[PDB]
Design a protein around this nucleic acid. Structure first.
Ligand SMILES: [Mg+2]
Ligand SMILES: [Mg+2]
Ligand SMILES: [Mg+2]
Ligand SMILES: [Mg+2]
Ligand SMILES: [Mg+2]
Ligand SMILES: [Mg+2]
Ligand SMILES: [Mg+2]
Ligand SMILES: [Mg+2]
Ligand SMILES: [Mg+2]
Ligand SMILES: [Mg+2]
Ligand SMILES: [Zn+2]
Lengths: 114, 82, 66, 177, 101
RNA sequence: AGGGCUACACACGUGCUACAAUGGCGCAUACAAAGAGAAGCGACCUCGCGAGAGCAAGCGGACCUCAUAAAGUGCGUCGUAGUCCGGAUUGGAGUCUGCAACUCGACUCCAUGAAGUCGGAAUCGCUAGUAAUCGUGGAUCAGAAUGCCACGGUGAAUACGU
C-alpha cells in the first residue's frame, strides 16, 4: 500500500485502488494486475509485501507521478518556448485544440470575471 | 494528423526553395505562403518568413520544433484585449 | 566548513547519451542521466559536425517517407 | 580538483608559452564564483525568498547569505534592512566542482544556446554571465519550482586586463560567440 | 449565382474529368503498402500535388443547374429547394406528390 | 494564394452531457421498424488493444452490404462517496477523408479526472403509443453533427373545473 510514493487506500478492489496513481488508470491497472496474475475481485488489504513489491516494480516498468509530471510539464514548456499557436493558448490561458471561446470556454478560462 | 502511410507534406515550390537556400542561401529570408508544410531537418538554420495573411513573420527554425508546420508560428488573429 | 546547515554533497556519476560519463561530487540526491554535454554539443565541436538523439530523430526520422 | 589539475598543467603551460611571463603567478587565477538571486518580489510574498534560498542551496551545497537592502529606495518600495536577496560565494574545491558542473552540463542546456557573450568583463578581466533559466543546472528537479526564475553569475578572475581574462577563460574552452 | 460561379464550376468539372485517371492512379500508388515508400510514394506525392488543384473532385459544390444556388441542393433532383418545389408542384417531376402518412 | 465567417472582459436563445445506485463497470443472452447504395454499400478471411488497413465475393438491390440494435433479463462488483458518477480540459501516439486536418474535421489508444450534490426571480413542452427515455436510418456530404428530417423499443401521471 506504498506504491510509487503514495499511500494507496485499502478496502477497495484491485483496479479501483491503482487508479490513484498519477499515470495508471483503469486499463493500465488491469494490465498490471494481469502481469502480476492477481484476480481483480480481491482487495489491496490481504496482499502480502512481496506481492506489493512485484506490483511496485511493474508500476516502475511504467511511468510514475514524478516522471509523468516532468514530461508533460516539459511538453507544455516546449510549447511556450516555441511561441507557437499552442504556446500562445497555453500562455494566455485559452483553449488549445481549437474549441470555441465566444462561449463554453469556462473550463480553460476560469469562472466568469465580471 | 496526417497519416504515416502517406508520409509528411511540403509544397514542391517550397521544397525547391529550401534546397536552394540550404546550399547557397545567405542573403535574405524566404518569403513563402505554404503554411501547411511540415518542417524538415534539412531546413535547420534558415529564417524563412511564412505568410500569416497580410505580411510574412520571420521564424528562425530551431532543432526542437520538428513535427510542427509553418502555420503554428504565424498568428492569424490579432487580439490586444477587451 | 560548518555542520548541520548545508545539504548533502556526495559523489555522483553523470552519464550523457553519447557515452561521456563524469565523476562529480555534487548535490542532487541520486544518479543522473543527462542528454547533452560539452562533447556532444553542436556549437562546442562543429555546428554541422555533431549528431543528436532527440527531436531530430526519435519523433521524426522513424516516420519520414522521403 | 580535476579541473584544477587541468588548470595547473595545461592552462598554465599554454598561458606561459603564449604570454612569455617571468613568473608563474603572473597568470590569471580565479578568486571566486558568486551566485546571485536578486529576488525583488519578497515585498509581496516573503516566502519567495526562502524558496530562492532553498534553490541556491540545491544548486550549490551552501546555505545562502540572505543579502540586505543596501539603502532605502522608495521607487522599488524597499526600506533599510529588508531582505531582498540571497547569494553564495564558492571558492576553492567547491568553486571547481560547481564550475565543471556548469561548463559541462548547464552551458549546453541553455535555451536556444548560440554561444556565450564575449563582452562581459568590467574592463580589467572579471567575467559576469546571467542565465535566464535556472533549469539548465542539473541539481534542479523541476518538480518543486513554483516559478522558473533566473540568476546571474560572476567569475572573479585575478587577470590584469580583458585580454588576459579572455585568454584564461578561452583556455577552458568557453564558446565565446 | 453571379454567372462567374457557374463558369467556375464548369471549368472545375472540365479539369476534374480531364485530369481524371491520373489523380486516381497516384492515390492508388500512395495507398498500397506493397509499393516502396522510399522513393515511388514520395515522388507520387510530389506529382499529385503539382497537378492543378481544380482537377480534384473535392472542389465540387454541386450547384443548381439553372439558378446556381450552392445551398439546399438535392442530388436526386439536381435542383435547389426552390426549383424543386416549383417544378415538382407544377408537375414536371414524375411520380412526385405531397406525402401524408 | 493565405486569412475570416471557429475571432472573446462578457450577456441571451436552442440543444447535448451529467450531478448518480431506477446507476456505473465486466461477462452471457434476447426482441425492431424505416431507409441508402456502382467515380457506392462494401460479406468473409487475415493484421492491429482500438480507430482502421490488405485481400476481396455479393448487390442497382423483399436476394448482398451498411447492421451486432439499445434500454431490457441473468450473473457479480461498487456502497451514498465528489466516488468505479461526470468526461470537460491537457500531453503523448495514431487511423480515415481530402492536394493539404496548424488557425479549422471526426474518431481511436494511454494518461490527466474540473465545474457539477437536482439549480433564484422567472420560464417552456405534453391529455396519450402522448410526455420521459433507448437505439437506428436518411438528406446535406470528398471528410465533418449534440442540429434537421424519418423510424421503431419500453412507456406514464393528471384533467375536480373556467
Ligand atoms: Mg490513475
Ligand atoms: Mg465539398
Ligand atoms: Mg453558382
Ligand atoms: Mg458559428
Ligand atoms: Mg452521456
Ligand atoms: Mg431501400
Ligand atoms: Mg472532483
Ligand atoms: Mg471527474
Ligand atoms: Mg390536444
Ligand atoms: Mg393512470
Ligand atoms: Zn555526451
Amino acid at each position: 500500500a506504498r506504491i510509487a510514493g503514495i499511500n494507496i487506500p485499502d478496502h477497495k478492489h484491485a483496479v479501483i485502488a491503482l487508479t490513484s496513481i498519477y499515470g495508471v488508470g483503469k486499463t493500465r491497472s488491469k494490465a498490471i494486475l494481469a502481469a502480476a496474475g492477481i484476480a481483480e475481485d480481491v482487495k489491496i488489504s490481504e496482499l502480502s509485501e512481496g506481492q506489493i513489491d512485484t506490483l511496485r516494480d511493474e508500476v516502475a516498468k511504467f511511468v510514475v507521478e514524478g516522471d509523468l509530471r516532468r514530461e508533460i510539464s516539459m511538453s507544455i514548456k516546449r510549447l511556450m518556448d516555441l511561441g507557437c499557436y499552442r504556446g500562445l493558448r497555453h500562455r494566455r490561458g485559452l483553449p488549445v485544440r481549437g474549441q470555441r471561446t465566444k462561449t463554453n470556454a469556462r473550463t480553460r478560462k476560469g469562472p466568469r470575471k465580471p | 494528423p496526417r497519416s504515416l502511410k502517406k508520409g509528411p507534406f511540403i509544397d514542391l515550390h517550397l521544397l525547391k526553395k529550401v534546397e536552394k537556400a540550404v546550399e547557397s542561401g545567405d542573403k535574405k529570408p524566404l518569403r513563402t505562403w505554404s503554411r501547411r508544410s511540415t518542417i524538415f531537418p534539412n531546413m535547420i538554420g534558415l529564417t524563412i518568413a511564412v505568410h500569416n495573411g497580410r505580411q510574412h513573420v520571420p521564424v528562425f527554425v530551431t532543432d526542437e520544433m520538428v513535427g510542427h508546420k509553418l502555420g503554428e508560428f504565424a498568428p492569424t488573429r490579432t487580439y490586444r484585449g477587451h | 566548513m560548518k555542520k548541520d546547515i548545508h545539504p548533502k554533497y556526495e559523489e555522483i556519476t553523470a552519464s550523457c547519451s553519447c557515452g561521456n560519463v563524469m565523476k562529480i561530487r555534487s548535490t542532487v540526491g541520486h544518479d543522473l542521466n543527462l542528454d547533452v554535454c560539452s562533447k556532444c554539443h553542436p556549437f562546442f565541436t562543429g555546428k554541422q559536425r555533431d549528431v543528436a538523439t532527440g527531436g531530430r530523430v526519435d519523433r521524426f526520422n522513424k516516420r519520414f517517407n522521403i | 580538483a580535476k579541473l584544477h589539475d587541468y588548470y595547473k598543467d595545461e592552462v598554465v603551460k599554454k598561458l606561459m608559452t603564449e604570454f612569455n611571463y617571468n613568473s608563474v603567478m603572473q597568470v590569471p587565477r580565479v578568486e571566486k564564483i558568486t551566485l546571485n538571486m536578486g529576488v525583488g518580489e519578497a515585498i509581496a510574498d516573503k516566502k519567495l525568498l526562502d524558496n530562492a534560498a532553498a534553490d541556491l542551496a540545491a544548486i550549490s551545497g551552501q546555505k545562502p547569505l540572505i543579502t540586505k537592502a543596501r539603502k532605502s529606495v522608495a521607487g522599488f518600495k524597499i526600506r533599510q534592512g529588508y531582505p531582498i536577496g540571497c547569494k553564495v560565494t564558492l571558492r576553492g574545491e567547491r568553486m571547481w566542482e560547481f564550475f565543471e558542473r556548469l561548463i559541462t552540463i548547464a552551458v549546453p542546456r541553455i535555451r536556444d544556446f548560440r554561444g556565450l557573450s564575449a563582452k562581459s568583463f568590467d574592463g580589467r578581466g572579471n567575467y559576469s554571465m546571467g542565465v535566464r533559466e535556472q533549469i539548465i543546472f542539473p541539481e534542479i528537479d523541476y518538480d518543486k519550482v513554483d516559478r522558473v526564475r533566473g540568476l546571474d553569475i560572476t567569475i572573479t578572475t585575478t587577470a590584469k586586463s580583458d585580454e588576459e581574462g579572455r585568454a584564461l577563460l578561452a583556455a577552458f574552452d568557453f564558446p565565446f560567440r | 449565382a453571379k454567372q462567374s460561379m457557374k463558369a467556375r464550376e464548369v471549368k472545375r468539372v472540365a479539369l476534374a474529368d480531364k485530369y481524371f485517371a491520373k489523380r486516381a492512379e497516384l492515390k492508388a500508388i500512395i495507398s498500397d503498402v506493397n509499393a516502396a515508400s522510399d522513393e515511388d510514394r514520395w515522388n507520387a506525392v510530389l506529382k499529385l500535388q503539382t497537378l492543378p488543384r481544380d482537377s480534384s473532385p473535392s472542389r465540387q459544390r454541386n450547384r443548381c443547374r439553372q439558378t446556381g444556388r450552392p445551398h439546399g441542393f438535392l442530388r436526386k433532383f439536381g435542383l435547389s429547394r426552390i426549383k424543386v418545389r416549383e417544378a415538382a408542384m407544377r408537375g414536371e417531376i414524375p411520380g412526385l406528390k405531397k406525402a401524408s402518412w
